[PDB]
Amino acid sequence: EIPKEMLRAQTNAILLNVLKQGDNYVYGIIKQVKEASNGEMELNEATLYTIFKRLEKDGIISSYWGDESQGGRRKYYRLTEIGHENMRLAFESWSRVDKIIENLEANKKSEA
Amino acid sequence: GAEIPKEMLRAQTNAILLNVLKQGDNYVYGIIKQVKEASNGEMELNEATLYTIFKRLEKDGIISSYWGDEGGRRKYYRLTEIGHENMRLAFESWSRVDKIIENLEANKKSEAI
Ligand SMILES: [Cu+2]
Ligand SMILES: [Cu+2]
């Protein structure tokens, strides 16, 4: 199986990169990800809300109301500067981890 | 704040340990030694953290353990056939996830035109 920890990490990863490309609202994120995957990836709405609560807690995304001029009120999400840094740190740490593994493969090889 | 959350730190540590075992059955002190050298002395994992992670991985069937021969007798750990398959499933799903975002970036770009 893909364990539950990894599925959530994949969904977290998708949501942050979508918001990196532009402010968005939940149904639009789900629609856009389904489109980018030719209908194959249907994100679970319930799962977005728990992740969004966490990301808002950590200051990684913020929200604001739009579409009020028509008589409605939709919540939009934005990647914050803390969020941009978190993505940079995730890239940099994962590159460090990957380099350690590459080094290990080599050290194993050169011993031979 | 912005720092790497505990979930991702655990995922990164899991990644390292399973990739060490992918490259060959091994024992805790030997894993710690190898990671320390592959990280140019900077990452010296504590044996307790390995025991914590291995207890979980063994419970979930991803690794198993067995004794070597002898002035001591080391406990070896191995990636199971489920563990190997999990790595392939992980590679394949993360590759799909990455391409989805790549598509969204491309779509975003070409629309701007
Ligand atoms: Cu990424
Ligand atoms: Cu990997």
CA-nearest residue of chain B to A55? B1
Beta-ladder partners of B66: B76
Chain B residues touching residue A3 (CB < 8 angstroms): 60, 86
| B51 and B21 co-located in one domain | yes
Task: Record the resolution, in angstroms.
Answer: 1.9
Q: Structural domain tally of chain B?
A: 2
CATH of residue B64 = 1.10.10.10
Distance of CA A89 to the CA centre of its chain: 13
Distance CA B113, CA B108 (A): 9
Q: How far is B78 from chain A (nearest CA, A)?
A: 17
**Distances in Å between the alpha carbon of B29 and those of B13, B20, B59?**
16, 12, 21
| B61 and B85 co-located in one domain | no
The answer to whether the CB of B55 falls within 8 A of the CB of B44 is no
Distance CA B108, CA A16 (A): 15
| B44 and B29 co-located in one domain | yes
SS (H, E, C) A57-99: HCCCEEEEEECHHHCCCEEEEEECHHHHHHHHHHHHHHHHHHH
Domain that holds residue B14: 1-79
In sequence order, which residues have a C-beta less than 8 Å from that of residue B83 and are 6 or more positions away?
Answer: B18, B21, B57, B61, B62, B63
Q: Which residues of B touch A (CB under 8 A)?
A: 1-5, 7-8, 10-12, 15-16, 19-20, 23-24, 34-35, 37-40, 43, 60, 86, 89-90, 93-94, 96-97, 100-101, 103-105, 107-108
| B44 and B63 co-located in one domain | yes
| B53 and B92 co-located in one domain | no
| B55 and B101 co-located in one domain | no
| B30 and B67 co-located in one domain | yes
